[PDB]
Amino acid sequence: PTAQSTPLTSGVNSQEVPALTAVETGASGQAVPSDVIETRHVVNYKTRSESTLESFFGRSACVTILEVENFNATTDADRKKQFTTWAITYTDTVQLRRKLEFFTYSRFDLEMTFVITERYYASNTGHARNQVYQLMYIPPGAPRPTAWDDYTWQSSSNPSVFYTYGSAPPRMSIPYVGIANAYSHFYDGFARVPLKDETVDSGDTYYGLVTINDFGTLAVRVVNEYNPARITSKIRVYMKPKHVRCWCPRPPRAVPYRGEGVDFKQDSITPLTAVENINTF
Amino acid sequence: PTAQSTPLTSGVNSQEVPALTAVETGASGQAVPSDVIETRHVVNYKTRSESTLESFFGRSACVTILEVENFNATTDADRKKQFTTWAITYTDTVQLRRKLEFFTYSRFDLEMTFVITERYYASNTGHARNQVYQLMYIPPGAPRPTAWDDYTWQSSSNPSVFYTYGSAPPRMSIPYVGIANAYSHFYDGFARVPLKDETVDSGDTYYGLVTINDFGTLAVRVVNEYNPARITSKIRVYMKPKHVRCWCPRPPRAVPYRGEGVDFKQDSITPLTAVENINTF
Amino acid sequence: PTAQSTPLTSGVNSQEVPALTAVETGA
Amino acid sequence: GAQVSSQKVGAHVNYTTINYYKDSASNAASKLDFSQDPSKFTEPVKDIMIKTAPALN
Amino acid sequence: GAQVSSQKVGAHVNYTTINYYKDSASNAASKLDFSQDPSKFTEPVKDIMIKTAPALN
Amino acid sequence: GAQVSSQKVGAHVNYTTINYYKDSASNAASKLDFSQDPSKFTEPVKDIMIKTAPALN
Amino acid sequence: GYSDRVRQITLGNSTITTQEAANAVVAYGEWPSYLDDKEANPIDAPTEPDVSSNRFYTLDSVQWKSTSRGWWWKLPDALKDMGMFGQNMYYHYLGRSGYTVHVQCNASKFHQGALGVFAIPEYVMACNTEAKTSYVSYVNANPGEKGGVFDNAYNPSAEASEGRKFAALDYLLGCGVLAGNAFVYPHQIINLRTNNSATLVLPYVNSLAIDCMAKHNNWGLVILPLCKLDYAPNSSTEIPITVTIAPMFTEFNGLRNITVPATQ
Amino acid sequence: GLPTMLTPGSSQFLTSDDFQSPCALPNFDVTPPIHIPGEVFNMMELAEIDSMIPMNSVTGKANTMEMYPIPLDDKGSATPIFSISLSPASDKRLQYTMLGEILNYYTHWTGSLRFTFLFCGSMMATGKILLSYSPPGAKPPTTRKDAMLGTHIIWDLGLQSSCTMLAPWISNTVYRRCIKDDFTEGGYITCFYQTRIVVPSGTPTSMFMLAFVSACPDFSVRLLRDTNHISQRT
Amino acid sequence: GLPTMLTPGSSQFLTSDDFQSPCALPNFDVTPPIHIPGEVFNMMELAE
Amino acid sequence: GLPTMLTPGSSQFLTSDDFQSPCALPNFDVTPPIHIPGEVFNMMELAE
Ligand SMILES: CC(=O)N[C@H]1[C@H]([C@H](O)[C@H](O)CO)O[C@@](O)(C(=O)O)C[C@@H]1O
Ligand SMILES: CC(=O)N[C@H]1[C@H]([C@H](O)[C@H](O)CO)O[C@@](O)(C(=O)O)C[C@@H]1O
Ligand SMILES: [Ca+2]
Ligand SMILES: [Ca+2]
Ligand SMILES: [Ca+2]
Ligand SMILES: [Ca+2]
Ligand SMILES: [Ca+2]
Ligand SMILES: [Ca+2]
Ligand SMILES: [Ca+2]
Ligand SMILES: [Ca+2]
Ligand SMILES: [Cl-]
Ligand SMILES: [Cl-]
Ligand SMILES: [Cl-]
Ligand SMILES: [Cl-]
Ligand SMILES: [Cl-]
Ligand SMILES: [Cl-]
Ligand SMILES: [Cl-]
Ligand SMILES: [Cl-]
Ligand SMILES: [Cl-]
Ligand SMILES: [Cl-]
Ligand SMILES: [Cl-]
Ligand SMILES: [Cl-]
Ligand SMILES: [Mg+2]
């Protein structure tokens, strides 16, 4: 299937007036060039292949950067650097988010890919053996780790991936896991109805998708015990929606995001650069 | 299909004179040995397989050498060493360019391959963990990085390849991406028509293909944060045209290039070495 | 094979009493 | 000896298996078995109990 | 269970796919779907509008 | 979708190709094309020139 | 005889006429309908109140002036205290509904102005404090039939507790997108020289078959002056805009005692 | 084992690759689909929807609702009413339309562009307006007598409220680039009073029209890319 | 050898993977099965 | 996985190799071809 070819047409002198319409109806303009000019025949062999939803979304996009370290931790703060937990979301970054938010609802499977990098913290503390990483998906309700070597990492039921530094970026597919019939990118509502004269707090409650979304937690550790040399690591998380369907198009985000909601920032709500004059080519 | 076999022929005494012609016509000489000598029959089983366009161009050729580094950068100049950008072209080198320029127009898909190498800058600063590289193709219009760790590298839509040092040279195919029906290797013209009495500058404008070509930008970084040991890297970029068609042959480049155009250099326009005499075997 | 679908039913006024049982039986 | 079977459906249909090893213990997971008979635990009674009837008559 | 399909054309024609996994979520990208119906957004009107006719009569 | 074709002969005969990718740009080299028509460059003349005849008559 | 400008709509015991319409929109080309057995979720026999609730309810009118920046409502919120629809909504945990929305604004052949009338699924709006995100009170999100107004200035609150309302900034559609692109949503325009009403028929839209109406608004209704009201003899004149909405194909599940939401 | 040999590309992560991968949640039972209104299949469906051009984004009006309405009056000036270049991805006014936003995820575009104008004066206002598209390479038109030599339509104001002017696909290249670029420049769109707007007494003598842009069915885009319209601090 | 190219995921250990692996005790003769009462097929049987 | 064994040559980049590789711009719609005069198929055409 191709885009529209142009038919051979000449001129008209007619009570048929395709150049006029009334957009009050809610219909967009419909006229094409053959309606308002003399056209030659042009066969159009070009296709809209690269603007299908699958093509538009068919990329692994970075959605967050996590940090973990491996060293002999002697304080509570340093013990917490030996592993990390991250609430799974696409709102830490802006690029994939904005593309998804052309739509109100979506349904897709996910390809997740990870890029893991290290550096030496210092050079006077010897070296470090090659590190193995554990990335554990903790669905809502499953126990979250409080230390890098607690019982949760045995991961009898949670899916974990063990990645060996220097090997190919690890990768797995996730099905469409939504508890509704599609994912909602926007939710105009609340998680509960506050009722007349109840004592529950109404002053610090939130609004929208953040009150109802929960895709679980990614927990990451280095499996190795500490070397004399402290190693610091970054884990970049990539998402590619595949087998995609979307519904109910929206205007795209026009101004910077300032969090997980639709809120905007007072110093950043002037996207247009003014033109010198209405007659500026 | 083979090259031409030679038929058995003897001599002639005839008003047929294939030895004479008139090249004023624009025809090259056409006569073959059987026209002007006595020949034996020789069956020719040899083929022109290796001079087809696909065979002539069927090699990955180095087209540029890029440099990137990874270290703790404290100045603007050193921050700019943490990533590099390169306008994609075949004119940084001469060998593939000269071969392509046997032709005026071409159409091909591209195989791109990369060879990535490192060395230690110094030896008194410890060591460095194995590095991951990101090579991002930035099509014209997409935002270009101003730092090695800015938002552009999330690459939601641009294609990126993440390469792990020591792994096989990375490789990808690119379709024929020209906005015309073939690539032009030569363009005898300008990007715009300068008009009578306009105030636009005409003293510093350029000419030819450089005014209209834009294949985007390759951006490269080391993804890892800095180690105590500074690592410097080279990325060699290789191109192989495949599925090749070409049109309108040209004399090949006879003197050194001096830039992206057809210009020549005053001290290098004497390719022939003079012979002692017109009668020198 | 799927989990059980729910049939369209209305009300009853009947000597059939599926709401009562006796779990002493071990059922 | 390739086995072609239905995949578990995703967001939006067959797959192929070949066994490479001579021991069945080497094989991948058993195919989905939807068998069940809850009544051996939920109703292991000698005499049939009709729901609509009295449990004790 | 090999699927043979047309490739997207290049500069100058089929390819083969076998699914290796039991979950469709594991599969590569969905095949090109050229479906479209712009009129549900560009012309979602109750009464048909003929271009050559007046929009309001 | 396997293609079986003749190899280029060596010192002393078929090979098999399967395309793994959905884009033809991903494919290996085009097969040998022995097409040629030197006369479009060596003899691009309007009126036929017979070798044995005078070029100018 | 028949005309794109003249229409009658009857639902239940209520009828609307217009003599200066401009066709009618059926959002996404889909008429509302009841929930099919093959797409159903809650298993209790639903209540389908039909004519008691599926009828035109007329909201309090608002005044269009040369300085108005626009108006918004949410649905089913705007109808929550409307006759038997409101009662059925609050006596049940779950509900679904389509709508016929009829926006009314007449003037004269000497007035000018144009209103964009948009039906927006999941019309999530920005909050009015930069100390928090997504920080809007239930009461401010759900004003009922009075709806709210847009402003052409954004002045977020000094303290988080004072900014728990929408920052309904007109040119960003109250949600960080440019208002000129709102036409991707089902819409009509009331351009005073052409028409005096807009009619939009809306199917139920959600990622679920049925949902909690008291928690979740499925549609926003936005009325924006695209071209300001002007009238030469009196530039400070006001003309009413009246919004009349009928639920359609309403269906409710999970009957219990009545929901009485917080009011402060 | 089966003898194999690794080729270049081995172990790389290309973000536009298209491979299978193991499922982390095997035999998961996805929520059954139901019909939801408004399904979209192609971004070009969205490009065919009219959205408003912020045509009057001058100082004091840019980034306000007043950036959209195009000023008109009954004075019959020979000055153009508006003038804009056919650069739908890169122009300061076109780039933020729905079409412009979609184009900024692509590198190449082709096809015809539809400009639809809605007159929002009173019913008592009459007028004729010339809308023109001049393909590039000549003096940009600043007078009606130059504009009318190009592709154009004369719009008579009346009961039918709206008029559509086409910029038909007229280009040297098969695609234009979604950036400001001399080689793939698109030409000039302008507008002049053909007669003038006329009103009787007791009627506003100044008023507005709205301009919309959308893609035609011959329109397509290529070469996915990141947009310059969204970013974040690092 | 057959030309091959490693993809992302190569060499990872995903704990929910489902691959074949070589048997450490080849040609082992498992104890024949007998019928045992109370076989369970699904955790939902227990939930009922 | 299918048992395999890497042979010599594995991971090398031979510049005259002839392998497939993944496309960086999947489902790209190339500009349709048109007839251009002067097509060349073999360098020996030029040698004549
Ligand atoms: C992350 C970082 O900046 N690390 C730097 C360290 C640490 O600052 C100190 O060793 C801590 O005591 O110092 C170095 O001189 C070193 O050890 O070789 C350079 C190294 O890059
Ligand atoms: C690129 C280069 O030439 N590097 C050289 C360095 C640097 O010049 C200094 O270390 C900079 O201070 O010096 C060496 O003696 C060293 O450190 O072992 C040898 C090394 O090859
Ligand atoms: Ca015509
Ligand atoms: Ca066609
Ligand atoms: Ca002879
Ligand atoms: Ca021969
Ligand atoms: Ca009973
Ligand atoms: Ca018409
Ligand atoms: Ca002769
Ligand atoms: Ca009923
Ligand atoms: Cl463990
Ligand atoms: Cl260890
Ligand atoms: Cl300007
Ligand atoms: Cl990143
Ligand atoms: Cl790092
Ligand atoms: Cl000599
Ligand atoms: Cl109310
Ligand atoms: Cl209360
Ligand atoms: Cl073996
Ligand atoms: Cl301004
Ligand atoms: Cl072999
Ligand atoms: Cl296996
Ligand atoms: Mg009321």
PDB file of C-alpha atoms in Angstrom, chain I:
ATOM      1  CA  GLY I   1      31.957 -22.789  10.510  1.00  0.00           C
ATOM      2  CA  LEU I   2      28.431 -21.516   9.930  1.00  0.00           C
ATOM      3  CA  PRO I   3      28.673 -17.713  10.153  1.00  0.00           C
ATOM      4  CA  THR I   4      26.827 -16.498  13.266  1.00  0.00           C
ATOM      5  CA  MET I   5      26.494 -13.228  15.174  1.00  0.00           C
ATOM      6  CA  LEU I   6      25.850 -12.912  18.918  1.00  0.00           C
ATOM      7  CA  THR I   7      22.884 -10.775  19.972  1.00  0.00           C
ATOM      8  CA  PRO I   8      22.170  -8.933  23.219  1.00  0.00           C
ATOM      9  CA  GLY I   9      21.374 -11.344  26.044  1.00  0.00           C
ATOM     10  CA  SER I  10      24.326 -13.572  25.108  1.00  0.00           C
ATOM     11  CA  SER I  11      25.858 -15.346  28.148  1.00  0.00           C
ATOM     12  CA  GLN I  12      23.336 -13.945  30.667  1.00  0.00           C
ATOM     13  CA  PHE I  13      21.684 -16.138  33.322  1.00  0.00           C
ATOM     14  CA  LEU I  14      18.003 -15.212  33.492  1.00  0.00           C
ATOM     15  CA  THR I  15      16.452 -17.233  36.335  1.00  0.00           C
ATOM     16  CA  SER I  16      13.132 -17.555  34.483  1.00  0.00           C
ATOM     17  CA  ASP I  17      14.802 -18.757  31.247  1.00  0.00           C
ATOM     18  CA  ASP I  18      13.698 -22.025  29.664  1.00  0.00           C
ATOM     19  CA  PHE I  19      16.550 -23.687  27.808  1.00  0.00           C
ATOM     20  CA  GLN I  20      17.897 -27.174  27.322  1.00  0.00           C
ATOM     21  CA  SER I  21      21.134 -28.201  29.034  1.00  0.00           C
ATOM     22  CA  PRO I  22      23.412 -31.264  28.973  1.00  0.00           C
ATOM     23  CA  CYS I  23      22.599 -34.057  31.413  1.00  0.00           C
ATOM     24  CA  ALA I  24      25.272 -34.791  34.027  1.00  0.00           C
ATOM     25  CA  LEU I  25      24.055 -38.408  34.335  1.00  0.00           C
ATOM     26  CA  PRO I  26      23.512 -39.583  30.746  1.00  0.00           C
ATOM     27  CA  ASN I  27      21.411 -42.710  30.099  1.00  0.00           C
ATOM     28  CA  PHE I  28      20.216 -42.826  33.704  1.00  0.00           C
ATOM     29  CA  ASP I  29      17.258 -45.175  34.251  1.00  0.00           C
ATOM     30  CA  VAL I  30      14.722 -43.270  36.398  1.00  0.00           C
ATOM     31  CA  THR I  31      12.671 -45.185  38.957  1.00  0.00           C
ATOM     32  CA  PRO I  32       9.425 -46.243  37.261  1.00  0.00           C
ATOM     33  CA  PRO I  33       6.417 -44.134  38.249  1.00  0.00           C
ATOM     34  CA  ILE I  34       3.525 -45.588  40.229  1.00  0.00           C
ATOM     35  CA  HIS I  35       0.143 -44.081  40.994  1.00  0.00           C
ATOM     36  CA  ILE I  36       0.146 -42.022  44.194  1.00  0.00           C
ATOM     37  CA  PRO I  37      -3.101 -40.553  45.548  1.00  0.00           C
ATOM     38  CA  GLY I  38      -3.618 -36.799  45.748  1.00  0.00           C
ATOM     39  CA  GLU I  39      -1.823 -35.531  42.634  1.00  0.00           C
ATOM     40  CA  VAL I  40      -2.006 -31.743  42.225  1.00  0.00           C
ATOM     41  CA  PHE I  41      -1.785 -30.016  38.825  1.00  0.00           C
ATOM     42  CA  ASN I  42      -2.532 -26.364  39.603  1.00  0.00           C
ATOM     43  CA  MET I  43      -2.099 -24.128  42.651  1.00  0.00           C
ATOM     44  CA  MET I  44      -5.658 -22.862  42.024  1.00  0.00           C
ATOM     45  CA  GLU I  45      -6.957 -26.344  42.940  1.00  0.00           C
ATOM     46  CA  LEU I  46      -5.554 -25.648  46.411  1.00  0.00           C
ATOM     47  CA  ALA I  47      -7.044 -22.131  46.433  1.00  0.00           C
ATOM     48  CA  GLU I  48     -10.536 -23.665  45.994  1.00  0.00           C
TER      49      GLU I  48
END
